[PDB]
Tab-separated table of C-alpha atoms and ligand atoms in Angstrom:
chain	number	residue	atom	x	y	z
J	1	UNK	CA	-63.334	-99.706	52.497
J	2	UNK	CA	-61.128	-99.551	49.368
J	3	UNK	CA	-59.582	-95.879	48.316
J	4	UNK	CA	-61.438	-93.811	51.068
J	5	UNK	CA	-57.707	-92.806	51.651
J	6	UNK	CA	-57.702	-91.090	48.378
J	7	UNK	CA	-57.751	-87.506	48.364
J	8	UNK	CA	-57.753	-85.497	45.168
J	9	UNK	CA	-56.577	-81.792	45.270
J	10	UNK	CA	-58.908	-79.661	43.155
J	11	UNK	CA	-57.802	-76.054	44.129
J	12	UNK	CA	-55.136	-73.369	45.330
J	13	UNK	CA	-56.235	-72.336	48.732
J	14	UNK	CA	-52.843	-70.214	49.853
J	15	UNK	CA	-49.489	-70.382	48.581
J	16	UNK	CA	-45.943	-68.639	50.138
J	17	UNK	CA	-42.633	-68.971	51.785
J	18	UNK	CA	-44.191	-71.619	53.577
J	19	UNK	CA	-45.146	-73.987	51.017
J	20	UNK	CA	-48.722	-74.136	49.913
J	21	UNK	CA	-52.434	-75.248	51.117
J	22	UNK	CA	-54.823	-77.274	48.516
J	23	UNK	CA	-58.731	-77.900	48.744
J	24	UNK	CA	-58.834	-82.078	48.787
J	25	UNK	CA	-61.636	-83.825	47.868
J	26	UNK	CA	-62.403	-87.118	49.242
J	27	UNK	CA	-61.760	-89.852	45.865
J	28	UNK	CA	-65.029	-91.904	47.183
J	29	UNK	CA	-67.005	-89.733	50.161
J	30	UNK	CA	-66.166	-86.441	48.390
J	31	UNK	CA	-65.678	-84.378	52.032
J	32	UNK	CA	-63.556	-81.118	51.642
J	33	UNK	CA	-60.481	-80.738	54.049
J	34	UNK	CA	-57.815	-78.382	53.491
J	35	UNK	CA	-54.222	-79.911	52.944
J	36	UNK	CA	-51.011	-77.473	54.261
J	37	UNK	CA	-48.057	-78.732	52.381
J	38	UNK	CA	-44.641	-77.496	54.210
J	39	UNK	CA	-40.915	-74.201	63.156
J	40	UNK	CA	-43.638	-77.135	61.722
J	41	UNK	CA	-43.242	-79.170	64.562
J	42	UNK	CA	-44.336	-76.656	66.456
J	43	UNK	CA	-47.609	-75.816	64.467
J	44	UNK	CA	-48.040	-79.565	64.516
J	45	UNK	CA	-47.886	-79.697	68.179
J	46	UNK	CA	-49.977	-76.736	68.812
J	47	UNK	CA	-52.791	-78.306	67.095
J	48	UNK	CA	-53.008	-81.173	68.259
J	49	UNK	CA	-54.242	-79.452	71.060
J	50	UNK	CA	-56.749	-77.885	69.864
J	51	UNK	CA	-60.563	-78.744	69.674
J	52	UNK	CA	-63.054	-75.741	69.131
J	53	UNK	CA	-65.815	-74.750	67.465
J	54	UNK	CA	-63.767	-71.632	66.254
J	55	UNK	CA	-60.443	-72.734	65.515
J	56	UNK	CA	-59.712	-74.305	62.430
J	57	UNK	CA	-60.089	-78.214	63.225
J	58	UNK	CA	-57.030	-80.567	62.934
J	59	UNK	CA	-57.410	-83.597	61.602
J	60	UNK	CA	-53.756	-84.870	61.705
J	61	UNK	CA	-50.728	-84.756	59.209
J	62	UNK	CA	-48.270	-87.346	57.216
J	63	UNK	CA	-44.654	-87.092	56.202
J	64	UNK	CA	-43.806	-88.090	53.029
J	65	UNK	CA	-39.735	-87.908	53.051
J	66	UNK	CA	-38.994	-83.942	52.985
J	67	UNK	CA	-42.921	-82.955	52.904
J	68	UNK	CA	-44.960	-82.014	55.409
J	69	UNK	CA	-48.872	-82.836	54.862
J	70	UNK	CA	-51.476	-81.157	57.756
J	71	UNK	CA	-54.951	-82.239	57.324
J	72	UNK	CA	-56.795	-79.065	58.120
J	73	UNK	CA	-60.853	-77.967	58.527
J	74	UNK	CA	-61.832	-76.555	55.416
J	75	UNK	CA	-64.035	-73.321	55.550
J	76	UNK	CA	-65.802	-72.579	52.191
J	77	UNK	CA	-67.216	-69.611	53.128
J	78	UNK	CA	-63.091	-68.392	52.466
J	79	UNK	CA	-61.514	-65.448	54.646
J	80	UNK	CA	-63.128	-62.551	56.518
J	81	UNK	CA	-60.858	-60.110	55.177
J	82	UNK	CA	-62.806	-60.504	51.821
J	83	UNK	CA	-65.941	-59.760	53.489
J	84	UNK	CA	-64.791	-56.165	54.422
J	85	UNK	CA	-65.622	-54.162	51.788
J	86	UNK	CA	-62.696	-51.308	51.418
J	87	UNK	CA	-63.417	-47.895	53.304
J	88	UNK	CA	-66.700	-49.089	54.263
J	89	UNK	CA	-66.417	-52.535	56.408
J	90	UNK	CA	-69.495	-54.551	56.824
J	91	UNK	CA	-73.050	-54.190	58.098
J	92	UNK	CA	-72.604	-53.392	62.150
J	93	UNK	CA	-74.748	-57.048	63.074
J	94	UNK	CA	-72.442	-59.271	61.102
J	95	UNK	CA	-68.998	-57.572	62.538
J	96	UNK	CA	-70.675	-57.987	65.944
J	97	UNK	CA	-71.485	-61.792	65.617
J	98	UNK	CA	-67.878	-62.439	63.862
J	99	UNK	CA	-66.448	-60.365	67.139
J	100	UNK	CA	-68.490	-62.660	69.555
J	101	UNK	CA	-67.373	-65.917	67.806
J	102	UNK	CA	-63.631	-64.324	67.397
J	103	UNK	CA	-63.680	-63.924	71.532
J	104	UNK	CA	-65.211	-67.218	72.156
J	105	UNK	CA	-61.645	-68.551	70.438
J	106	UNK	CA	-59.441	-66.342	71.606
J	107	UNK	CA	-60.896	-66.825	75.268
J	108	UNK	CA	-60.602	-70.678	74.356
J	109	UNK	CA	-56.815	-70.186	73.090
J	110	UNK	CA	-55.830	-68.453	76.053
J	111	UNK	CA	-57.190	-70.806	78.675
J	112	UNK	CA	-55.554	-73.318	77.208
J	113	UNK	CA	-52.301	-71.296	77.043
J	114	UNK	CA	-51.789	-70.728	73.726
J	115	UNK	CA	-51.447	-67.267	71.942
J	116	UNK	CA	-52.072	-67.113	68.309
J	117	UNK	CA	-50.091	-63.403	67.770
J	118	UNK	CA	-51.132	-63.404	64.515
J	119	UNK	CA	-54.811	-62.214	64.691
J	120	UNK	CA	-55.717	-60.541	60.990
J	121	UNK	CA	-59.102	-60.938	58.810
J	122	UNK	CA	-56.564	-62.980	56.503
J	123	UNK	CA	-56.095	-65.759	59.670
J	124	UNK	CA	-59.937	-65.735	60.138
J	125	UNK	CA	-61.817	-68.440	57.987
J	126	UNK	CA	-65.373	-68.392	57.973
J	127	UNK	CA	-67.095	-72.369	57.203
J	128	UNK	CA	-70.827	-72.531	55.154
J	129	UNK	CA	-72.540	-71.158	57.363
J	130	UNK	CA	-70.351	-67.696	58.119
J	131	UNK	CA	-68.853	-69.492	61.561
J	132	UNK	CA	-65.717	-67.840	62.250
J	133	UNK	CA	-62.583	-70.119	62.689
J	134	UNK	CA	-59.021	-69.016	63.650
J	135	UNK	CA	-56.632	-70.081	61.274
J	136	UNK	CA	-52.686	-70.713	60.757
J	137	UNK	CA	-51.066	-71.606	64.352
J	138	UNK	CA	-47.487	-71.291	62.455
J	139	UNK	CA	-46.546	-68.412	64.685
J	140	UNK	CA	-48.299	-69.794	67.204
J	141	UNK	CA	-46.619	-70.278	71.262
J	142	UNK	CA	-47.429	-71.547	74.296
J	143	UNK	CA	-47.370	-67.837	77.166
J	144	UNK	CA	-48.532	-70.560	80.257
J	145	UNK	CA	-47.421	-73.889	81.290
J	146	UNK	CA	-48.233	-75.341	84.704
J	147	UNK	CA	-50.192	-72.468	85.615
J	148	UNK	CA	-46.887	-70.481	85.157
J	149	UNK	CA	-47.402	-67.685	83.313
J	150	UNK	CA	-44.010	-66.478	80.808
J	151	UNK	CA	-43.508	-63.288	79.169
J	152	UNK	CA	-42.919	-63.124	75.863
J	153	UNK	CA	-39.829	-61.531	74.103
J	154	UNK	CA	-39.736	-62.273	70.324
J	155	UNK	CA	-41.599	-60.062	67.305
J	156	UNK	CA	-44.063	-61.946	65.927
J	157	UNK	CA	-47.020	-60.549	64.264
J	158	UNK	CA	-48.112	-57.950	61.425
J	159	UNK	CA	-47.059	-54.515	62.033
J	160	UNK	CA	-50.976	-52.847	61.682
J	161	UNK	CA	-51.968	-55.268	63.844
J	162	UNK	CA	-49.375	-55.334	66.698
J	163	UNK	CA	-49.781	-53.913	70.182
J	164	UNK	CA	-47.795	-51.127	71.285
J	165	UNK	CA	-45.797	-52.668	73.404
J	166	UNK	CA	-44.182	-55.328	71.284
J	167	UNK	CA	-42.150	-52.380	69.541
J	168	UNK	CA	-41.472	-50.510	72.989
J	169	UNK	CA	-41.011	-52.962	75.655
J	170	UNK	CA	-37.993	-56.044	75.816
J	171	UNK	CA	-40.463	-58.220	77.713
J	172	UNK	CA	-44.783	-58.345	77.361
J	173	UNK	CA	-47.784	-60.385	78.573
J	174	UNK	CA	-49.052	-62.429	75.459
J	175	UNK	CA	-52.953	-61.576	76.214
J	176	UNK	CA	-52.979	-57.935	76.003
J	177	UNK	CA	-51.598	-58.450	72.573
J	178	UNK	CA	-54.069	-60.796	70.833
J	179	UNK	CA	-56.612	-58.502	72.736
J	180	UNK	CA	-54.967	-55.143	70.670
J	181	UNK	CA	-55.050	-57.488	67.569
J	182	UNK	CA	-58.703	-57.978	67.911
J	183	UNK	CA	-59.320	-54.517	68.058
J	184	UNK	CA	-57.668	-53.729	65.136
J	185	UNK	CA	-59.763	-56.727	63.054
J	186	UNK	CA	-62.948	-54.935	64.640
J	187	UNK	CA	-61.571	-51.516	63.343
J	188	UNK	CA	-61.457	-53.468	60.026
J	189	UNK	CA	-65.107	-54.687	59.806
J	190	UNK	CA	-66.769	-51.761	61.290
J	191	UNK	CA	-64.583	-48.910	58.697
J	192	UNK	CA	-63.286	-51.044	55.825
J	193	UNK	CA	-59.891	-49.689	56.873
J	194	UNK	CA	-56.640	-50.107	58.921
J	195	UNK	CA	-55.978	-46.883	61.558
J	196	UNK	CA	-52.316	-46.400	61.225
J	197	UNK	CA	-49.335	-48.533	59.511
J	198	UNK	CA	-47.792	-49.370	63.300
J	199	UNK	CA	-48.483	-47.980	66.330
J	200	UNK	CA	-45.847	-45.525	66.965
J	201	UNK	CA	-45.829	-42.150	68.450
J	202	UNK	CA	-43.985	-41.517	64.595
J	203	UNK	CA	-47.116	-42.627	63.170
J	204	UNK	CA	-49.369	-39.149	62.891
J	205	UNK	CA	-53.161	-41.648	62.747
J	206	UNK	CA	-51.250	-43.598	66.038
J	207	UNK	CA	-50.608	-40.037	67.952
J	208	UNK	CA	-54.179	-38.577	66.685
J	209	UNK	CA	-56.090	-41.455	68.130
J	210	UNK	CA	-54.446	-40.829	71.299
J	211	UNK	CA	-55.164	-37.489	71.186
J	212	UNK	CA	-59.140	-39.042	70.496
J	213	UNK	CA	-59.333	-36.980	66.993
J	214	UNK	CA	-62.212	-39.338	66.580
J	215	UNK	CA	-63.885	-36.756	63.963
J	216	UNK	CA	-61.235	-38.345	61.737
J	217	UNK	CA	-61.336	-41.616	59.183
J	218	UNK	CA	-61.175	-44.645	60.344
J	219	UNK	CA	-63.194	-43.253	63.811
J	220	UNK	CA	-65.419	-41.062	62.061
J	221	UNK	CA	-67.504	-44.045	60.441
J	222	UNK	CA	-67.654	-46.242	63.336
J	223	UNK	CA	-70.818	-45.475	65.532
J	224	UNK	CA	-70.334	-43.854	69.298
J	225	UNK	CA	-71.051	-47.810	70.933
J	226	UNK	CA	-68.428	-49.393	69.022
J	227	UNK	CA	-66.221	-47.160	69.354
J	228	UNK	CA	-66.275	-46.817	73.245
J	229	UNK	CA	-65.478	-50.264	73.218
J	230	UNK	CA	-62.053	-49.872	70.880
J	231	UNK	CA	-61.135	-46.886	73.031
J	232	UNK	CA	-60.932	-49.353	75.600
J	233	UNK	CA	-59.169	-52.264	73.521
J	234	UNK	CA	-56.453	-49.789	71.693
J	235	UNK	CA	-55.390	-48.563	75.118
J	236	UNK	CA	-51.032	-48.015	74.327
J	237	UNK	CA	-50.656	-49.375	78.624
J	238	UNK	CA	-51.348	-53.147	77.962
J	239	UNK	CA	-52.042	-53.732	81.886
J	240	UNK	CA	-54.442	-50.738	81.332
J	241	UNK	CA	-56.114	-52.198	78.626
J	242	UNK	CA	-59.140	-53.948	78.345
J	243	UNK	CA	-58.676	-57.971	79.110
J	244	UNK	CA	-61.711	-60.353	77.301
J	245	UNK	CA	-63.907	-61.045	80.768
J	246	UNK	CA	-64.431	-56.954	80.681
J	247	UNK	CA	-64.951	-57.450	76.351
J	248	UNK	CA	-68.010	-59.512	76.948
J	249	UNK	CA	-69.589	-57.479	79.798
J	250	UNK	CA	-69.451	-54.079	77.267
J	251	UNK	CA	-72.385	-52.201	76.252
J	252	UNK	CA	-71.871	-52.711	72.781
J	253	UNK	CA	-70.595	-56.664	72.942
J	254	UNK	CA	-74.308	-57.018	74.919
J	255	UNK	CA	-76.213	-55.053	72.510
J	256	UNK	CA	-78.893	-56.883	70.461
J	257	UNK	CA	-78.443	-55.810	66.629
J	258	UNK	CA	-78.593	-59.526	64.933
J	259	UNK	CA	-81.481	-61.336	63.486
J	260	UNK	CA	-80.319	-65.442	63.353
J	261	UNK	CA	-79.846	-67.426	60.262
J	262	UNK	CA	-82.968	-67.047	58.187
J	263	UNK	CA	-85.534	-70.172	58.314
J	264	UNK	CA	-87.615	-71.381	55.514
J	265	UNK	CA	-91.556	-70.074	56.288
J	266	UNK	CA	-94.697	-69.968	54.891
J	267	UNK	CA	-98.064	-67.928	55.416
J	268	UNK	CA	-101.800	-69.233	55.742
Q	1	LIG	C1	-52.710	-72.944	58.119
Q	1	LIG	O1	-52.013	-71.983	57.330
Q	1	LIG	C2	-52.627	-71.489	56.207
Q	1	LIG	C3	-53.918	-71.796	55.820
Q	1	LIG	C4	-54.494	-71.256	54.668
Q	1	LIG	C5	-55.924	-71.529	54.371
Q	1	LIG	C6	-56.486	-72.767	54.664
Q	1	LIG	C7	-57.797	-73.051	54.351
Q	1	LIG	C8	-58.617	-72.097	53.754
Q	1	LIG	C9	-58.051	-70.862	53.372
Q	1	LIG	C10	-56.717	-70.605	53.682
Q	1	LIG	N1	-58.720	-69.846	52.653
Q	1	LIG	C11	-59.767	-69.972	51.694
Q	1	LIG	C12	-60.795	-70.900	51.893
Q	1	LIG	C13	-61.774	-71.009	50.899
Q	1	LIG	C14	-61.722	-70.219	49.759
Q	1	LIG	C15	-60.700	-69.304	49.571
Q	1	LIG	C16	-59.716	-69.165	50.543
Q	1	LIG	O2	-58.607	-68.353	50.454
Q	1	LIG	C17	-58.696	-67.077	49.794
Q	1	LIG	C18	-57.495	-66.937	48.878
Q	1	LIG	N2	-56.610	-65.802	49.205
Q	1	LIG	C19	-55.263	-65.951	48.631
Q	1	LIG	C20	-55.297	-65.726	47.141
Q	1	LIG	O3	-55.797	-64.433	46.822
Q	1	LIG	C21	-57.121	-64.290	47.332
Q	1	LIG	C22	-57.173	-64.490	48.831
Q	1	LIG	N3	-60.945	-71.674	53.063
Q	1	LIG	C23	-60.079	-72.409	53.786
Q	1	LIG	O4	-60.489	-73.284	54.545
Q	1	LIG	C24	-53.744	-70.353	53.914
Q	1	LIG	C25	-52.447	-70.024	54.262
Q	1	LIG	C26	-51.897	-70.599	55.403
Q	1	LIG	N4	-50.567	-70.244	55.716
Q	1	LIG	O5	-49.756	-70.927	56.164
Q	1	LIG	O6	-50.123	-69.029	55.447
């Protein structure tokens, strides 16, 4: 079939450092993908391992001489982190369902061995029908390899967003940290706000949630199930912290809040 090659780029979906990614329209089927135009070897690599209903879908990539082309799922409904409206969040239902679908790829990530360490609202791409996808696997690594288990070392991440012990410890366990991330995106949804800058006994919201001065903003607008559940998650001990298997057996995780998407229907 003539041209079905042929992919026109109609808009500016990211740009940085990096390079940029483009919304490309199919010349004769018209299907959306997202195109990353570019340490890439790597993000290559990790995703071509990778097949989940919420992870961003690879579809492959091409090298044209010095540029790098990765043929990416593209999610129309944009980035959860515009979804949270600032100082308020979202309503309590739709944080829980994007939590849910944000554990079912995390727990997917990490059985395959893989640790995304850069969990954020911006990473987290939601398709037409508000499905949550993890994005951007550029800072990606792989914590187990035949069933060995390594410890990570290096500082990767986005300092509101980091676990404790990646700015205390020389050596961590990569779960406990995209656990600590997750907590800090539901913090996000459920206040419209970020706790502290870092977490740092320096930091005065770091050393007040410790001290549970939950009477205080962000805590103060998150309701008492909810928030038993991130006093379990931003736990500073990462082998005292909550791991995902005890996430989806919590109170509030189980609670029923969440209507499905709405179906056409008539009366009479
Ligand atoms: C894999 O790595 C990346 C991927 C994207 C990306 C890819 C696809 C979409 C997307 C972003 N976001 C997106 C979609 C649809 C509409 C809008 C979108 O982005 C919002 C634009 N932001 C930047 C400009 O200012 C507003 C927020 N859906 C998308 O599917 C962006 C950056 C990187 N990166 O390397 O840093």
């Amino acid at each position: 079939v003539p041209f079905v090659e042929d992919w026109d780029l109609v808009q500016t979906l990211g740009e940085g450092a990096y390079g940029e990614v483009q919304l490309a329209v199919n010349r004769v089927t018209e299907e959306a993908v997202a195109v990353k135009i570019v340490n890439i070897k790597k993000e290559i690599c990790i995703n071509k391992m990778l097949n989940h209903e919420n992870v961003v879908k690879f579809y492959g990539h091409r090298r044209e001489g010095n540029i790098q082309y990765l043929f990416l799922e593209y999610c129309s409904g944009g980035e959860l982190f515009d979804r949270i409206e600032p100082d308020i969040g979202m309503p309590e239902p739709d944080a829980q369902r994007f939590f849910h679908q944000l554990m079912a790829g995390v727990v997917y990530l990490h059985g395959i061995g893989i640790t995304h360490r850069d969990i954020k609202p911006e990473n987290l791409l939601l398709d037409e029908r508000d499905n949550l996808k993890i994005s951007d696997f550029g800072l990606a690594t792989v914590f187990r390899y035949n069933n060995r288990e390594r410890l990570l070392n290096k500082m990767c991440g986005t300092l509101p967003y980091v676990a404790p012990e990646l700015l205390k410890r020389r050596e961590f366990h990569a779960e406990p940290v995209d656990v600590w991330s997750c907590g800090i995106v539901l913090t996000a949804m459920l206040a419209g706000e970020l706790p502290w800058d870092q977490p740092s006994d320096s930091c005065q919201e770091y050393s007040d949630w410790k001290e549970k001065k939950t009477y205080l903003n962000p805590w103060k607008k998150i309701d008492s199930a909810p928030l038993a559940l991130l006093h379990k998650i931003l736990v500073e001990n990462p082998s005292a912290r909550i791991t995902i298997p005890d996430i989806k057996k919590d109170r509030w995780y189980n609670k029923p809040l969440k209507k499905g998407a709405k179906r056409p229907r008539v009366t009479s």
